[PDB]
Structure 1
Amino acid sequence: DEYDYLFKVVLIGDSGVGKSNLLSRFTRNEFNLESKSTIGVEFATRSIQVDGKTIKAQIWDTAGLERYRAITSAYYRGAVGALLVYDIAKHLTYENVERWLKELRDHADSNIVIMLVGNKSDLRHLRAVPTDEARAFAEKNGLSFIETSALDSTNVEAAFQTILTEIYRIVSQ
């Protein structure tokens, strides 16, 4: 039936980090090793309750490839939240998180809630970004932080549920 809120959230990050599987995990509890590059944008939705209120989240899975980065930025418009994702096992993807946040201070609301996400925590032995270094950078820049595995599903629910809650109580007064 009725929601109290409709929160528009975007997923951004380098190509390959797992955005589309975070989304598929979170909205239909599905994952896949084989992948199709996200062409432009993909849409999915899921409703949750925080502090007694039904919030329907509208998630836009953007695509990290640059071919499409003119058209992803279109959808940054009026989004309340953004999951900024990097692959824990591929250092370069973490290096680009700085350029991915300037990307929000050009095409998106200047008062948006951001969570940094280290994805692929299941690849323990390939880890190229230590959890401590990341979380340090996270709050130096006023971002919330979590590590997920879309594959085994660790923290995927938590990640979304955290950012949606954080959002839901910025709005009040």
Structure 2
Amino acid sequence: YDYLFKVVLIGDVGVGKSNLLSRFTRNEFNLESKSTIGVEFATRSIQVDGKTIKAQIWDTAGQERYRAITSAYYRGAVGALLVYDIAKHLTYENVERWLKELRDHADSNIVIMLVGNKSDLRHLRAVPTDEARAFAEKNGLSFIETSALDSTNVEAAFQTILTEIYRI
């Protein structure tokens, strides 16, 4: 590989972060996935503007009651995938909080993509694409909508963040 990019997934419990990870790195999916214990990462190589980037993608539970995610999680991260659930409006609402946590724990220069995941659930939508696109644009984040379930826009979400990072 030519460069290593550490990227982190963050977003509320249940929005689909670990299945974004597994979709991207092993092309596997799991409808019966339990809340994530401790921290995981997995790697995959791709091609970005001619180069081989090894993407190191980190993942962990969205739950922070008694046990908070520390700076060590975010340490060295060039990209954050900030995921919410298009069908549950509270998860979009908590984006603020994740931005706050990014400001708090991550580099001032982290590239942040807002990802509205679970697009297959077209009919259950509680968050309109153009509202979120406009929230992204107003906060200076990239934006995409994915489905880890039917595998739509996943490799794109990743390739885009990784390209942005490479071109900074």
Q: Which TM-score band applies after superposition, normalised by the shorter structure?
A: over 0.9
The structural deviation recorded for 1:74 is 2.2
**Aligned partners of 2:150 and 2:66: how far apart in 1?**
29
Q: How many residues align?
A: 168
Contact 1:39–1:68 (CA under 8 A) maintained in structure 2: no
Structure 1, unaligned stretches of length 5 or more? none
How many percent identity over aligned positions?
99
Distance in 2 separating the partners of 1:85 and 1:69? 20
TM-score (norm 2): 0.96
What is the distance in 2 between the residues matched to 1:61 and 1:88? 20
CA distance in 1, matches of 2:60, 2:71: 8
Indicate conservation of the 8 Å contact 2:15/2:91, yes or no.
yes
Deviation of the 1:52 alpha carbon = 1.0
Give the TM-score of the pair, scaled to structure 1.
Answer: 0.94
In structure 2, distance between residues paired with 1:146 and 1:68: 32
Assess, with a 3 A threshold, how the Cα gap between structure 1 residues 137 and 13 changes in structure 2: closer, same or farther: same
CA contact 1:40–1:68 (8 Å) conserved in 2 = no
Q: Is the 8 A contact 1:11 1:84 kept in 2?
A: yes
Q: Deviations over 1:66-90 (max 9, x none)?
A: 1475245421011000000000000
- The one-character-per-residue Cα deviations of 1:115-151 (angstroms, maximum 9, x if unpaired) are 0000000011110000000000001000000000000
Give the Cα–Cα distance (whole angstroms) in 2 for the partners of residues 136 and 71 of structure 1.
Answer: 28
State the Cα distance separating 1:160 from its structure 2 match. Answer: 0.1
- 1:6–1:58: 8 Å Cα contact kept in structure 2? yes
The gaps in structure 2 that reach 5 residues or longer are: none
Give the Cα separation in 2 of the matches to 1:107 and 1:68: 18
Q: Which runs of 4+ in 1 moved over 2 A?
A: 67-74
Query: Which residue is 1:76 aligned to?
Result: 74
Deviation of 1:42 after TM superposition, in Å, equals 1.0
Distance 1:27 1:118 in 2: 19
Quick one: distance in 2 between partners of 1:166 and 1:98? 22
In the alignment, the residues of structure 2 paired with residue 143 and residue 162 of structure 1 have an alpha-carbon distance, to the nearest angstrom, of 12
Task: Return the alpha-carbon distance in structure 1 between the equivalents of residues 135 and 38 of structure 2.
Answer: 29
SS of 2:67's equivalent in the other structure is: helix
Match in the other structure for 1:53: 51
Output the aligned Cα RMSD.
Answer: 1.1
- Give distance in 1, aligned partners of 2:70 and 2:27: 24
Is the CA contact (8 Å cut-off) linking 1:63 and 1:72 kept in structure 2?
A: no
